[PDB]
Design a protein around this ligand. Sequence first.
Ligand SMILES: CC(C)(COP(=O)(O)OP(=O)(O)OC[C@H]1O[C@@H](n2cnc3c(N)ncnc32)[C@H](O)[C@@H]1O)[C@@H](O)C(=O)NCCC(=O)NCCS
Ligand SMILES: [Cl-]
Ligand SMILES: [Mg+2]
Length: 163
Amino acid sequence: MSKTRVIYPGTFDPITNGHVDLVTRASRMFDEVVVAIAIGHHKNPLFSLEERVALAQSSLGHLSNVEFVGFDGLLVNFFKEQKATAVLRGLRAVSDFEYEFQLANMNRQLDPHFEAVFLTPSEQYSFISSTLIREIARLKGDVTKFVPQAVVEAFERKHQQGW
Ligand SMILES: CC(C)(COP(=O)(O)OP(=O)(O)OC[C@H]1O[C@@H](n2cnc3c(N)ncnc32)[C@H](O)[C@@H]1O)[C@@H](O)C(=O)NCCC(=O)NCCS
Ligand SMILES: [Cl-]
Ligand SMILES: [Mg+2]
């Protein structure tokens, strides 16, 4: 009867149609969804925080219950700051499933209030990762089918500053 707030953390480098599916799905089951972009100070993304948030907003802004925020630090401290109900993650593969079980268990020890829920992607998005998309763009392949148009354009505007 209170009000539910789920955080969806990630690097979103860049956001993909995969991520869009998950946020949309999550937006139907929870009151507020926060798309939370890990800055990644000492981890070196392709797109800046500003590009990453912008492409996210461009792609999911039409959902009234979705917020977008950059963060760094310990996910559990962010979790607490945001007074969240749970963290959402997607599970694509067996390695994902194992990493995430570990992380959830660790975070529960750091904050007993912590929680993690998981969605699995529809089969149309099961093969999409950011990394794979970077690599395909990088080799002048066509990523239109896997990402929003804004992201296509953003890839062209790095191929324009050279890349
Ligand atoms: C988990 C971290 C590394 C970010 O995740 P990641 O690099 O996977 O970002 P990415 O944007 O690619 O994906 C976000 C999430 O959605 C899922 N996902 C991605 N693409 C898809 C798809 N097509 N379909 C379904 N799910 C997907 C991923 O499996 C992932 O769980 C980040 O949360 C983090 O580092 N947190 C803070 C640091 C911390 O506290 N670290 C150690 C103690 S926890
Ligand atoms: Cl990545
Ligand atoms: Mg991914």
